[PDB]
Amino acid sequence: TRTIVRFNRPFLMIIVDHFTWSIFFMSKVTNPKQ
Amino acid sequence: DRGLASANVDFAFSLYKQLVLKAPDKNVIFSPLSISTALAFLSLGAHNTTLTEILKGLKFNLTETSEAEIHQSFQHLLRTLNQSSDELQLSMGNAMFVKEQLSLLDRFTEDAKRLYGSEAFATDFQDSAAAKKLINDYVKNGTRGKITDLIKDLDSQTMMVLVNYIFFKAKWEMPFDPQDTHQSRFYLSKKKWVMVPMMSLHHLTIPYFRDEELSCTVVQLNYTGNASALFILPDQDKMEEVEAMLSRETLARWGDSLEFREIGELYLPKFSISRDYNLNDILLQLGIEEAFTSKADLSGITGARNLAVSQVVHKAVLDVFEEGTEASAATAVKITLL
Numbered sequence A: 001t002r003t004i005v006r007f008n009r010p011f012l013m014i015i016v017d018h019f020t021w022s023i024f025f026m027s028k029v030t031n032p033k034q
Numbered sequence B: 001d002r003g004l005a006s007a008n009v010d011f012a013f014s015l016y017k018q019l020v021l022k023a024p025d026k027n028v029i030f031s032p033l034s035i036s037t038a039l040a041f042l043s044l045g046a047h048n049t050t051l052t053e054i055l056k057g058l059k060f061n062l063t064e065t066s067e068a069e070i071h072q073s074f075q076h077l078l079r080t081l082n083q084s085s086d087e088l089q090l091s092m093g094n095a096m097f098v099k100e101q102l103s104l105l106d107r108f109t110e111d112a113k114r115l116y117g118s119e120a121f122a123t124d125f126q127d128s129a130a131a132k133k134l135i136n137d138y139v140k141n142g143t144r145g146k147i148t149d150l151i152k153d154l155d156s157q158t159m160m161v162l163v164n165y166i167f168f169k170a171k172w173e174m175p176f177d178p179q180d181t182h183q184s185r186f187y188l189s190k191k192k193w194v195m196v197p198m199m200s201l202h203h204l205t206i207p208y209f210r211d212e213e214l215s216c217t218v219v220q221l222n223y224t225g226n227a228s229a230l231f232i233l234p235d236q237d238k239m240e241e242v243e244a245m246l247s248r249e250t251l252a253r254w255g256d257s258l259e260f261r262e263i264g265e266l267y268l269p270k271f272s273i274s275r276d277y278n279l280n281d282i283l284l285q286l287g288i289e290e291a292f293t294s295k296a297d298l299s300g301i302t303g304a305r306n307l308a309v310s311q312v313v314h315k316a317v318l319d320v321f322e323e324g325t326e327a328s329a330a331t332a333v334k335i336t337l338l
């Protein structure tokens, strides 16, 4: 009944700093083995 | 604080959309902060229309801010990010590699050191292979070996290269147990997949938001420290919709909408990806044009209109694993005589 979050298709990842509100890195993973 | 925040995030998402436009199905990884910082550093030497286009392209509002305030804000951000920390490793550096005979204004080299932390290293670009190794070694050192061949081609007539690197290594607040990592499907498309090591966590209470507006699920996985990873999972065939709606407003709405939820299971691949870019096309699309032409005004560097940008390049690497994340990037601005 609990939510499952399964990153098994293309996804985005944003590395952020909450203190400075900086986006350090931005990424889209369309193929982990590309 | 967060003075640079709004311009830097607007620039980040503008850059992202242009990077995707060039190759819409490829992996993307880049550091917008590295690129913003390198171009702000470049603008320290720019005058007139060349300067206006750079600062506008970086998404600053030139009617309400000064160039001096912008440089001071980058100086302050650099000091904040480089402060000593035990929780995570985070480093950013700037450097300039310059032909020894090129006359630089004392004001420029002093400002570059004071504001951007940049030394000026005498570099013989006529010995191109040696100049390339030196610059790449500087970047390799700053990124702890992770960005290895930032400079591939380097004109022997190069006069100056401005360089920024960023290095990030952090532990998850809630690390994955490698005993729970198992090879599983990753769907490249609806009907095609490969096998990847899929990490997993059970009964995990984290910030969560199901975005029905954009057909995606957002979760936040914290690092130790003030940094976190925001992961966005579009529904199948909704990636392009999410990408098209990326913006400061969308990011703020996501952040405002996150609520804690005990997730039954979270599955995340262990992966490492790398990309390298020639940013000329994208910067021109953002209106940064005079810096590249024979009308370039970089007279804040030398006192004369005798320099022009030839290329802006970027390389970035992202490594996600059970204990945490390592990510690094570097940006170089190559400059010739005019």
Ligand SMILES: C[C@]12CCC(=O)C=C1CC[C@@H]1[C@@H]2[C@@H](O)C[C@@]2(C)[C@H]1CC[C@]2(O)C(=O)CO
Residues within 6 Å of the ligand: A016, A017, A018, A021, A022, A023, B005, B006, B007, B009, B248, B251, B252, B253, B254, B255, B256, B258
């Ligand atoms: C868009 C935003 C606010 C407006 C601005 O000038 C810059 C940014 C980019 C970084 C964002 C930030 C806020 O919304 C709070 C965010 C999302 C932060 C990244 C992580 C964050 O601190 C949170 O997730 C807090 O919930």
